[PDB]
């Protein structure tokens, strides 16, 4: 009954904060500061409905240049923590701040997870409070790069205010879970997979 989610995207967009919003607890270190905080992948979990939500937070692996002390190692850690594959890649972006570095992050997502990764990706917009409606912003946006990203993700978008509490927090998480359910329906309940994921899964069952 696991539902596995990997938080991906540019550094500082509110990845760790989003994981915290979803799990409704302080699972991942998140705070104000100009430098990158998350330096290693982390895993946490919680229940929602009748599924165990499993979330993998990520360091700055999606930057164009290597900004990791051990990039290859952290990618491997990400794979091992999410095996046999994520149900969702949550591509975290800050609303009104989709830059070339965000475009780079999306390319790095495809490099690390495969050219088909976008098919299991949902675009999460953080800083929702900075808005009208999310749909209205999208239509009014002349950010062509962002429109391409959203189209590549089949129009699957959701907005969070990571500082949301109580009922507001609930509603936004409900919205995300609705998005996830719709994606899972489209994919016949399957998680994302690729050759490295299947290789890990086979290795784990051991020599015969
Ligand atoms: N107001 C507001 N602040 C946010 C939102 N999302 C994240 N933040 C803040 O932005 C700061 C950075 O958040 P993080 O959770 O560390 O973001 P991150 O993407 O994990 O950052 P790195 O691990 O450094 O790459 C924190 O102070 C958060 O409280 C949001 O939706 N609204
Ligand atoms: Mg973080």
The CATH class: Alpha Beta
Q: Write the element-wise H/E pattern from the N-terminal end onward.
A: EHEEHEHEHHEHH
Bound molecules: guanosine-5'-triphosphate, magnesium ion
Helical region count? 7
> Shape, please?
globular
Q: How would a crystallographer describe the biggest sheet?
A: 6 strands, mixed
Placed side by side, the strands forming the largest sheet appear as 2-3-1-4-5-6
Report the CATH topology name.
Rossmann fold
CATH superfamily: P-loop containing nucleotide triphosphate hydrolases
The chain-level structural class is alpha/beta
How far is the N terminus from the C terminus? Answer: 27 Å
**Helicity, as a percent range:** 25-40%
Beta-strand level of the residues, as a percent range? 15-25%
Radius of gyration: 16 Å
Region (G4): 126-129
Function: The heterodimer formed by GIMAP2 and GIMAP7 has GTPase activity. In contrast, GIMAP2 has no GTPase activity by itself.
GO cellular component, one term: endoplasmic reticulum
Binding site for GTP: 11-17, 30, 37-38, 127-129, 162
